[PDB]
Amino acid sequence: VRVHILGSGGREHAIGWAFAKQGYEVHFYPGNAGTKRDGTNHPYEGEKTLKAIPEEDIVIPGSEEFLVERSNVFGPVKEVARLEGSKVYAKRFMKKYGIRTARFEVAETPEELREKIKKFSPPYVIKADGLARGKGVLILDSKEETIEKGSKLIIGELIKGVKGPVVIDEFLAGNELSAMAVVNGRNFVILPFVRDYKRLMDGDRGPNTGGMGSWGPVEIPSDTIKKIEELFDKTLWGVEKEGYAYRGFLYLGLMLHDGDPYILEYNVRLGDPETEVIVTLNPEGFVNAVLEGYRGGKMEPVEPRGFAVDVVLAARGYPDAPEKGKEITLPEEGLIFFAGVAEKDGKLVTNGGRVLHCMGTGETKEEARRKAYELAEKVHFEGKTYRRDIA
Template sequence: MGMKILVIGSGAREHAIATTLLKGASVDEVTVAPGNPGMELDGIRTTHIDPSNHAALIEFMQSSGYDWALIGPEVPLIHGIVDDFHEVGLKAFGPTRAAAQVEGSKEFAKQLMARHAIPTASYRSFTDYEAAAAYVTKHGAPIVIKADGLAAGKGVTVALDVQTALGALENIFFERRFGNAGLKVVIEEFLEGQEFSLMSFVNGTEFWPMPISQDHKRAYDDDKGPNTGGMGAYSPVPQISDDTVEQAINTIVRPTVEALAEEGMPFTGILYAGLIATDEGPKVIEFNARFGDPETEVVLPLLTSDLGEGINAILNDEQPTFTWRTDATGLGVVLAADGYPDKPKKGTPVPTIPADADSHIYYAGVKNAKNPVEKKTTDSTSSTGLVSSSGRVLVYETVAPTLQDAQSKIYDTLNALDTTGFFYRHDIGAKALEAVVPDNK
């Protein structure tokens, strides 16, 4: 008998996790709570339980005989869902409330790094506008402004001039754009270099790194427009040398998991290190306490081992096995609703995107149309019966022998579709093709 697993969350990340779990021989059944109707097109079960309702999730786990849960989004982790599961003897893959502070508070993460000499940008934190504005005016730009708490990936402003920085502070302190996340602000020095994401499976002081990926945060081509939750990603990242990755593992990932364990907050789950390759070596931009989105959608398709078996081993304090393709690139592009990230347009019919053995549609912000119409168009696309319900609607992902092959396949398909009411970036992966691969030093 294979395992039964509950995945908590509703987006494209959870769709990719559920799909990957079901590929493994160790897993018979996956339910996603609450999931979305796009997942159901793949035969994935969903149950309409809100991730904030820990008691209902516990009851579902117990009554359905599920083996363990994997928590996708950050909010339940920061609110202690893993602690609540442990209290009633249920297994959950994710950090405790204490360990999840590495994502829940920018200041907590910064102080942890300072105590343990983990390389990151220098910073100051402020709780009132006047002091923060005075610091920005004196320091000058470029400078980075971050709401301290959770802001769904949108609480960071890279300000290239002082005016933009002051505007970001006004948004946080006066307009309260990020609610309680903006009661405190962290202001950082601007770091120059290419960013990359390094996710690791972690169990206490042991960890197993995944292939690195690169996310594209800005809404529009050429890194223009506002920050979003991510508009696309690719893995691996050829312009980041193996030596740089090795250095990041040794100077950032290892000391961070050891620091959390040493301070009485051992981390189990996925530690996401958002890093930048500077002239002085890799430095931390941010930590997340879970799988990244949309990085997960391009990294997990490269996994050649059984994801459920690996995580189950970690939860039982055994040695897991994770193996990855090294002969291919995963690339994914987000289809977003017009108006995202500020005012995404809802209710637009979602086009059907043709998928095959090497490509996948991972759904996020979708719901069932009230009166679905099977609409045939000249380019032979048809309606999925889904409509947009939030900003990021889906991720279209493929695995191909090279980055160029992956780009061609994705963009040839997307460019042929009628995407009225949606937009996407046309340059995911372009930085890798433009970059000169640095010598391994």
């Protein structure tokens, strides 16, 4: 009867919103002040939190997963999550199981970075082996800046708490694209494709962020989808051949290059703010596929109804230094997913980089767009930061 969601972002709230919408009792760990609408928030305290939860579903989205998965948890074990956790492992995996990816070398020291960089041409891509809070894939025009930053990235002087080998990836001209699936062993369903907005500012300027909005569904050619399906199959076969079974959500960050999809990286959970959009496109179908996947049964396709637009409101300073504690005025209605919000002095206040997700829905992309933006204009807090670019 009960769903337990680990996390505090809009993905988590979106996932909990759908379940609660289908009548399930939803617990968030720790959630945020918005997630109180759709369930009860509890503090997360590691294994103490999880040992207490009976059989019945736990949905993780994060790096919880380089320990969590107890058969309760709908996400892969640590060994499988190395696919996200070690970008080097992921590359060797893909070479092994014939999964189409960019040519690459591994530099474990700055010396190797100097030698091995000579195998590549100007638009250089260096990727930190470990998690960098998605801030450790560098794309640099010049070799000097690549060696200088990439060396520092190896030795832990670039990004505090990141250190160790780097992948040097052959840069791929193309259009970037994500694909996401609910997965049980070798069975999977692909979710609606959504388009995200990674840069902070309109016309894709400013710093990269964890996402400034999205919309969907996006229309992908059937031939492209069949190739995408084949990437999922070969990835899941590879997991089985390593002796493990993938349970949960699998995200492929792709690059369509010369007609073919290449895997830029694996994530072992759904994106934010892609989840907000996907969920809003069919709350029923998402919920069902997750339960069927969790339960070991047949999952039915997740068909999108209409279009969804997510306009993310973030704090002034996001991402490098978001300002907190600012008071949030909300409208009477509207689909909002809450992330960086807290309660303080009986009020709603900002408390994270990305504060709110304002959702618009409609029969067209433009209908969905206006509704989202109409809502974002009704929502206020100081230094309220958003892209009028979306969709």
